[PDB]
C-alpha cells in the first residue's frame, strides 16, 4: 500500500542517521534560508526597554541524507520527528524570554 | 479479560506509524471539531486580549 511504502521510506531515512553531525560534516558549510511571518508585536515597554513579538520563524536547509526517490509527494511528517533530525542551532541574541 | 484487552491494545499499535496522517497519499483527513466553553474569562482592555 502507499501508506506502507511511505512508512518504509521514512524508516529507511531515519535508520543509520547521526543527529550529532550536521549535513556535510567534513565539507562546505550548509546554507540555511530564513523566513519570518510576523504575526503581531504585542507591547513596546519603555520601563523594561523590551518588546514582545510573535512570529512564524521558518528555516530551510538541504540534508542529503533525507533524500528519497520512491514517492513523488512532498512528505509532511508529525512535528515529533523533528527530535530525530538535525536542525540548526539558531538563537536570538537579544531575547529575554521566549 | 484484562489479558484479551491488553492483546487488543497491543495488536492495535503493531506496525503503527504515528508520523503519517490517516490516508497520507490516498485521501484527505476530515477533522470534525467541537467546542464547549466552560467559562468565558475576563476580557482585558489594556492588553486587547481575552
Ligand atoms: C513540492 O514543493 C515544490 C515547491 O514548493 C512544488 O513545486 C511541488 O509541486 C511540490 N510537490 C507536490 C507533489 O505538490
From Swiss-Prot, chain A:
UniProt-recorded name of the protein: Gamma-aminobutyric acid receptor subunit beta-2
Similarity comment: family membership: Belongs to the ligand-gated ion channel (TC 1.A.9) family. Gamma-aminobutyric acid receptor (TC 1.A.9.5) subfamily. GABRB2 sub-subfamily.
Glycan-bearing residues: 2, 74
Expression by tissue: Isoform 1 and isoform 2 show reduced expression in schizophrenic brain. Isoform 3 shows increased expression in schizophrenic and bipolar disorder brains while isoform 4 shows reduced expression.
Disease: Epileptic encephalopathy, infantile or early childhood, 2: A form of epileptic encephalopathy, a heterogeneous group of severe childhood onset epilepsies characterized by refractory seizures, neurodevelopmental impairment, and poor prognosis. Development is normal prior to seizure onset, after which cognitive and motor delays become apparent. IECEE2 is an autosomal dominant condition with variable age at seizure onset, ranging from early infancy to 6 years.
Record-listed histamine binding positions: 91
Function: Beta subunit of the heteropentameric ligand-gated chloride channel gated by gamma-aminobutyric acid (GABA), a major inhibitory neurotransmitter in the brain. GABA-gated chloride channels, also named GABA(A) receptors (GABAAR), consist of five subunits arranged around a central pore and contain GABA active binding site(s) located at the alpha and beta subunit interface(s). When activated by GABA, GABAARs selectively allow the flow of chloride anions across the cell membrane down their electrochemical gradient.
Cellular compartments annotated: Postsynaptic cell membrane; Cell membrane; Cytoplasmic vesicle membrane
Domain comment (free text): The extracellular domain contributes to synaptic contact formation. GABAARs subunits share a common topological structure: a peptide sequence made up of a long extracellular N-terminal, four transmembrane domains, intracellular or cytoplasmic domain located between the third and the fourth transmembrane domains.
Native source species: Homo sapiens
Effect upon mutating residue 49 to T: In IECEE2; uncertain significance
Assembly and interaction partners: Heteropentamer, formed by a combination of alpha (GABRA1-6), beta (GABRB1-3), gamma (GABRG1-3), delta (GABRD), epsilon (GABRE), rho (GABRR1-3), pi (GABRP) and theta (GABRQ) chains, each subunit exhibiting distinct physiological and pharmacological properties. Interacts with UBQLN1. May interact with KIF21B. Identified in a complex of 720 kDa composed of LHFPL4, NLGN2, GABRA1, GABRB2, GABRG2 and GABRB3.
Curated annotation (Swiss-Prot), chain B:
Glycosylation site positions: 1
Highest taxon above the source species: Eukaryota
Assembly information from the UniProt record: Heteropentamer, formed by a combination of alpha (GABRA1-6), beta (GABRB1-3), gamma (GABRG1-3), delta (GABRD), epsilon (GABRE), rho (GABRR1-3), pi (GABRP) and theta (GABRQ) subunits, each subunit exhibiting distinct physiological and pharmacological properties. Interacts with UBQLN1. Interacts with TRAK1. Interacts with KIF21B. Identified in a complex of 720 kDa composed of LHFPL4, NLGN2, GABRA1, GABRB2, GABRG2 and GABRB3. Interacts with LHFPL4. Interacts with NLGN2. Interacts with SHISA7; interaction leads regulation of GABAAR trafficking, channel deactivation kinetics and pharmacology.
Free-text note on domains in this protein's UniProt record: The extracellular domain contributes to synaptic contact formation.
Family, similarity comment: Belongs to the ligand-gated ion channel (TC 1.A.9) family. Gamma-aminobutyric acid receptor (TC 1.A.9.5) subfamily. GABRA1 sub-subfamily.
Disease: Epilepsy, childhood absence 4: A subtype of idiopathic generalized epilepsy characterized by an onset at age 6-7 years, frequent absence seizures (several per day) and bilateral, synchronous, symmetric 3-Hz spike waves on EEG. Tonic-clonic seizures often develop in adolescence. Absence seizures may either remit or persist into adulthood.
Note: Functions as a receptor for diazepines and various anesthetics, such as pentobarbital; these are bound at a separate allosteric effector binding site.
Name under which the protein is recorded: Gamma-aminobutyric acid receptor subunit alpha-1
Residues shown, of full length: 38 to 87 of 456
Amino acid at each position: 500500500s502507499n501508506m506502507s511504502l511511505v512508512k518504509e521510506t521514512v524508516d529507511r531515512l531515519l535508520k543509520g542517521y547521526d543527529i550529532r553531525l550536521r549535513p556535510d560534516f567534513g565539507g562546505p558549510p550548509v546554507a540555511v534560508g530564513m523566513n519570518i511571518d510576523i504575526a503581531s508585536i504585542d507591547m513596546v515597554s519603555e520601563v523594561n526597554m523590551d518588546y514582545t513579538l510573535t512570529m512564524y520563524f521558518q528555516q530551510a536547509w538541504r540534508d542529503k541524507r533525507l533524500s528519497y526517490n520512491v514517492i513523488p509527494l512532498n512528505l509532511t511528517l508529525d512535528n515529533r520527528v523533528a527530535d530525530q533530525l538535525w536542525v540548526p542551532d539558531t538563537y536570538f541574541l537579544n531575547d529575554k524570554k521566549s | 479479560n484484562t489479558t484479551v484487552f491488553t492483546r487488543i491494545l497491543d495488536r492495535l499499535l503493531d506496525g503503527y506509524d504515528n508520523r503519517l496522517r490517516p490516508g497520507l497519499g490516498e485521501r484527505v483527513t476530515e477533522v470534525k471539531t467541537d467546542i464547549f466553553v466552560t467559562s468565558f474569562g475576563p476580557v482585558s482592555d489594556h492588553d486587547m486580549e481575552y
